[PDB]
Symmetry: D2
Subunit: 316 residues, 4 copies
């Protein structure tokens, strides 16, 4: 998985994520209208008046289990895979806001309007994992963005770490700090045409474009994707209209896409970019394409009786 955020000139949110796995089924654009009543697993609180939210997910037990989701005030949250690092308490803590790991995305998008607001509340959050005997625990870290900035939430054995994500990108393992240090290896990688230069008597020139970018890794490991996407996000020229920012988003992501055959998982199955989802706060629209179909599909929030009362789950 890979998440990405950036902005336009008018401080609109563009937030996007790859969902990378061997296979997926049943997930859907899923609307949680303002009229839906939501009972929080461990009686965490929330706004008297909930935000409309849209995202990609499944409904388990008439609750929306979001991979990623965004609200009508430009705030977006994606959960990404983090086993080996992610580590949670299994009991609520008295006098903290106790949020079940799977509702966390919904919670943050129902109740907050900015990263500022989210970050502030996190200071008193416990992220409870409820263990199911047959079912393996979801072990994630979270990329959260609005039109100004992103943060990274890494709950681990030693506690909850909330990072300012100055490169506006996230992947998988290992820790955010590691990835940030690692970037420094690549600090000389450039998008400029390679300047002619000499080694002794030998004149070196670039065949063409991309030579200054040499040193960037091209494998689909988590750290390499982190670096490649960080580079691409940071060097993509600012855009100023919706069409171009959604293009930006989707090209940026998928610059670290996982193609069939590239890379097997632990079980010997090839990991693939099964879908790419995005959110625009300019249009409060969610977008999506899949491995089987690159045509981007849009899901305007205003489409969408947000004053309604039940989860809507839209197919195709």
């Amino acid at each position: 998985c890979t998440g990405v955020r950036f902005s336009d000139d008018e401080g609109n949110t563009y937030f996007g994520r790859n969902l990378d796995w061997s296979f997926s089924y049943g997930e859907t654009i899923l609307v949680t209208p303002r009229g839906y009543h939501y009972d929080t697993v461990f009686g965490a609180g929330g706004k008297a008046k909930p935000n409309a939210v849209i995202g990609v997910g499944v409904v388990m037990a008439d609750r929306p289990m979001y991979f990623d989701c965004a609200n009508e005030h430009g705030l977006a949250i994606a959960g990404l895979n983090f086993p080996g690092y992610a580590s949670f308490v299994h009991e609520p803590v008295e006098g903290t806001e106790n949020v079940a790991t799977f509702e966390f995305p919904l919670w943050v998008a129902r109740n907050f309007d900015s990263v500022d607001e989210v970050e502030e509340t996190l200071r008193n959050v416990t992220l409870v994992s409820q263990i199911v005997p047959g079912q393996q625990e979801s072990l994630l870290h979270w990329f959260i963005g609005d039109g100004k900035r992103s943060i990274v939430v890494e709950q681990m054995a030693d506690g909850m770490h909330v990072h300012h994500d100055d490169v506006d990108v996230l992947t998988n393992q290992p820790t955010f700090d590691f990835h940030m240090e690692n970037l420094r290896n690549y600090m000389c990688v450039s998008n400029e045409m390679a300047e002619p230069t000499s080694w002794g008597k030998a004149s070196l020139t670039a065949w063409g474009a991309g030579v200054g970018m040499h040193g960037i890794p091209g494998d689909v490991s988590s750290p390499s994707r982190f670096v490649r996407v960080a580079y691409t996000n940071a060097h993509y020229p600012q855009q100023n209209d919706e069409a171009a920012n959604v293009s930006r988003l989707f090209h940026t992501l998928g610059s670290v896409q996982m193609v069939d055959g590239m890379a097997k998982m632990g079980d010997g199955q090839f990991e693939r970019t099964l879908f790419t989802s995005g959110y625009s706060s300019k249009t409060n629209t969610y977008y999506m394409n899949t491995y089987d179909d690159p045509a981007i599909r849009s899901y305007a929030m205003a489409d969408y009786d947000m004053d309604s009362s039940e989860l809507i789950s839209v197919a195709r």
Copy 2:
């Protein structure tokens, strides 16, 4: 630019390309019916009854100048940029079949039914480059594929080189031999899960997928792209239906796409994958998407009257 060929299990051709540049030239899907009368610039001969052809290209002086094209009999060709290496005579040679560099793709698609045929005729072909005030010579090499195999044509100052392209992939500079040697650097790159090993007492394990692929370059240089796409094409699992094979084609070419901001050219503009086109002989359909719109559009030779006699530019 990048070219890719593979088959399915029924000997059908899947062939396609990325056209990387800073600006479009007005190219379009371009049908050349069998009834179109074509007079080869240097009087190269031809099939009594030409093959139908479709491709992406431009009309200049009522001649189709294809970037890439394919015929009804499963043969496809792309021209890719090759300055610094491509070098041609400007005058026909007596006794040879003299083919203008710009008509070469049309010429092959129209007159040959297989790579065997083409390869055979190339032994008596001269590739002639017309000087045009005060445009620069177009200095390309060509990737040619059918259901069985691909070849590479590099006409250079030392003569015409025709290579068997065992990796079914082509990029830009330098020579084909260079690239094939270069691959050997990456022969330990693996799509398998990296297995646990120790350095001294330190046990090393992979975070997850893609660590075995570590070593593959991630930049958009010509050689880096050749290696990435060769890898990707050689590891992608064989597929058995049109839609999976088209998806295979496009994701494969996506693995080496150029994203805005990655790499400037010599004029200071970013090189980008403006479009990606493809061909299936199963369906005799041409496919295409663009930087602006990843939705793949199809253009079946069926939907056009190949008995007709005029050039058809199809706007999209």
Copy 3:
């Protein structure tokens, strides 16, 4: 800087380090005999009966300021550069063993016989940096080894971290954890002859030796040296005599040597491997060569009235 440790069959200590900087002067093989009276800066304690120690260093104020040193019972300590990470209190803590940063090497080698012993005492050590107004603080981390194992001492803002160094190598920045995670990128690098393999129809073979090792970085940055030396240390065959282990040591180090012209520091001067020092516990001998002279010089402890009373400083 780079430190290295390994062992033979008979559990003798081999410990070595590169000293890397633009220039050095006045350092010397320096013997601290058992008869020298040592007044510890902050009244840290120590054995009634001190270990003989030998090392490379300078004497400031009739005290031995050791770069690296080793004792007569096979324990060795090297300090390596760590600015940006290393961070110390400037006042002694009551009821801890307070050890001045510059005496730390001497302290550990005067008073301990094993890594076990050192590690145990560290649990109650404060590492005080005394600031001198003109003089910039020495900001190091420490590689410590005996014939069984090595540890790494990183005193930083958040406290003292003492790592088990399972790869038996240390360099400079960033943190030991980072370096350990980073190694995982290289876990497929092999010393085996690259097995012939095929990408599609194309057969790939190795030109010769070293192809399986491709993916190892070759620059002289701290992280790259860490990886390169870790690989070389872990893959070097065990040796069983002194000559061969000192060879092992010195080849291993210097596999990450810094050559003039390679790499400028912050001040624009080239960083070089100015000397390489080592220690054998089989012979309680210290060895050394320099940039200007690769001939290894030996300094047998028994040479060397260790029951004497003053620092000896041996030149050439």
Copy 4:
């Protein structure tokens, strides 16, 4: 194997090589006085009065078979392994000067005073490889240097290639052209301190020296070694005295030495830098150290009577 040439500011030759292999052949320092009578195997002509020569090699049938050697007039030559590419006729060609592959180094050192002279004569040289039951042909290429410049001789199935070696370096396979193209991948690798830059809001800085050199491969493959040593040789600051230049030579060759355990050959043995030799025309001295002993031994032509008439193997 690796070869290196540079000068000082007075036009003197500094020339040397790493001989990488699994096992020694019994080579020694080997003096060939002007009085030694030599009958070229295929009757190649020669200077009326031959140049004195010293080198490292073996005596077989009372003929000196040099790995490398140099003459009193500042000209040096090394043979380096080149199987897969080196290919020779086995019979002399009428009218050419036919030189046995094993006598080629002796032959050049004896008869020529400069690279200009040699290059000139190579236009009429045939390199002949004697079949020997049931030894394998020695399949080398040659690096030839004086005070001004180096050339590379690659006799292959398509003919004899003589290259101007503008980087003053040579390794093994593949062809020289390959390597020179390959260098262009690394044209942004810098010995400068990597300067602070930002990716988005993330400020990237270097830990210290060597981050600008990031991208240089660290493995001991032939191509990786060519790139590392080309880099190192081209960036090493010009030096002006014998000792600094010899130190320059040896550290430069050390940057691509093979350490035990790094890389197996096809027989399963580790390839190692068995010895490193060098030459100075300033002093007409040959230099050498070995895997076992990094102390550099000198062998001045002065200390031998070049008017004598017998081969002198000097044991070390």
